[PDB]
């Protein structure tokens, strides 16, 4: 017999004490070695309720990632609170590693294994584990990179699709690579490449899944309505550099309605002056490193917001979302919940 509860989880990883890489260094001092032979116990005749939007595991992951970033990605100048802080800002090795979250004694993690689970409600096949799978703390907006894929069908996730203030997470069942590059020899200019054939076919599948949730209305995509660059563009960190990519071409309604078939190339720019995602102010970093900067990632999900208003048309509008990085963790922690044994 158990009950839902919240406790201080501990971290596990496969960090290398010899690595200078930032996540490895953090995990060395913050985490413990992983388990070679994990234990999972499947529970039949047991039905449990889950709610990915009220899962406090997310809150703890959020603190760690903030701590990791704040103690690693140090700016040259920090502008917050109307004051000026000048520090040292050396270039770093940056590439996220998988992180497992685990429960102490008396607590256990319950895991939903329903292949079509949408994040809230009851689950039929529940297993009992001590640790989650290896989750990479990838910080991004609009697109979810390098995450886990949905088992069966594309899954739409929202605390409440009626509430246009609630984020929508689209969980893909087939990843699509995005190939971002800052070539050697403007040093701040970059670009991302995506296979238009793969992407548009997935995007077509996304609209058809949404139709199931919105009474077969016409599904339309639009660019973000406004906000800081971190949300109006696809924002992410590659090799320690802050990238901002324009995703207008990624959501082409014409290609999901001839010629669109090919290689899509998004314009990007590496910024040195960014808004601190600690909800504070502006941080200033050094120019990018010389040579070809490159990262190939899996697009495994999409963050969306749906338009509202007192209207009366048979078409819904969706826009690339983001901003709240806690949603990035929700998308990986959705099948987990902490219970306390007796």
């Amino acid at each position: 017999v158990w009950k839902d509860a919240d406790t201080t989880l501990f971290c596990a990883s496969d960090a290398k004490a010899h690595e200078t890489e930032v996540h490895n260094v953090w995990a060395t001092h913050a985490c413990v070695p992983t388990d070679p032979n994990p234990q999972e116990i499947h529970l039949e005749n047991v039905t449990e309720n889950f709610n990915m939007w009220k899962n406090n595991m997310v809150e703890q992951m959020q603190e760690d990632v903030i701590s990791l970033w704040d103690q690693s990605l140090q700016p040259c100048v920090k502008l917050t609170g109307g004051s000026v802080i000048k520090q040292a800002c050396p270039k770093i090795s940056f590439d996220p590693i998988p992180i497992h979250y685990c429960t102490p004694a008396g607590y256990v993690i319950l895991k939903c294994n329903d292949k079509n689970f949408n994040g809230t409600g009851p689950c039929k096949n529940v297993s009992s584990v001590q640790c989650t799978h290896g989750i990479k703390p990838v910080v991004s907006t609009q697109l979810l990179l390098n995450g886990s894929l949905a088992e069966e069908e594309i899954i739409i996730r929202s605390e409440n699709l009626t509430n246009n203030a609630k984020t929508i997470i689209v969980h893909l069942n087939k990843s699509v690579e995005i190939n971002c590059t800052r070539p050697s020899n403007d040093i701040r200019k970059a670009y991302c490449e995506i296979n238009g054939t793969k992407w548009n076919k997935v995007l077509k599948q996304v609209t058809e899944k949404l139709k199931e949730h919105f009474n077969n209305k016409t599904i339309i995509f639009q660019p973000p309505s406004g906000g800081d660059l971190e949300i109006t563009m696809h924002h992410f960190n590659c090799r320690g550099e802050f990238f901002y990519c324009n995703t207008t071409q990624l959501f082409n309604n014409t290609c999901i309605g001839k010629g669109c078939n090919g290689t899509i190339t998004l314009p990007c720019k590496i910024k040195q002056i960014i808004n601190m995602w600690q909800g504070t102010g502006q941080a200033m970093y050094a120019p990018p490193i010389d040579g070809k900067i490159n990262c190939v990632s899996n697009i495994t999900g999409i963050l969306l917001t749906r338009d509202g208003g007192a209207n009366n048309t048979s078409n819904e509008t969706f826009r690339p979302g983001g901003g709240n990085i806690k949603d990035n963790w929700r998308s990986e922690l959705y099948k987990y919940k902490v219970v306390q044994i007796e």
Partner: protein, 228 residues
Amino acid sequence: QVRLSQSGGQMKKPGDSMRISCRASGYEFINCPINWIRLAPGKRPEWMGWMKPRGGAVSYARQLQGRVTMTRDMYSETAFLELRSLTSDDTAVYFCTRGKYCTARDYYNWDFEHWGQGTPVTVSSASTKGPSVFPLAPSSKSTSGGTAALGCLVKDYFPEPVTVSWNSGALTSGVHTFPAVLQSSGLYSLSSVVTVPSSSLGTQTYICNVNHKPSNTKVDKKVEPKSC
């Protein structure tokens, strides 16, 4: 204590743009979304959109898509609303609002406990148009044992208001001047009536006096029984 202070009201012509501000205090500004709701008399309250201070994320109502813009200033904790291409339909009182439930971890946007004091915005043409005054004739036969109704119709004027007196204000008993209605043409119209003894229709003269200050118009109209 949560407070929302809005800027002062203003008047605009059709075609102009407007900007209004909402200064927030009493709570952690970046935690909660801010909404804008406008209210016009006779009409359903209309949600315009919300804005989340942290990254300035915004969601605009479909019917306002393209004309509206919401921003914020972090230092002064002030939210801003811009509305462009104004017309008569934008005449209303504009409110900023924030939901009752707000924590660092969670919120509910739509239970609006907190409202600003409101910013009235009028959008109208500077043009004026004087009223047409038509007689509402009593009847044809005189009944020496009853009361007769008469009045004048005051049609197609802009803007408000018009006033009506009778016999230069010497006739007040049984007078009814109705609230004006807004017609499809965009022009106002009202009626003024009065009940009098039918036995005085051949003796007393009844004149309605209509005043429309915006157009500098004063019209007197004698209302008398039709000839047939």
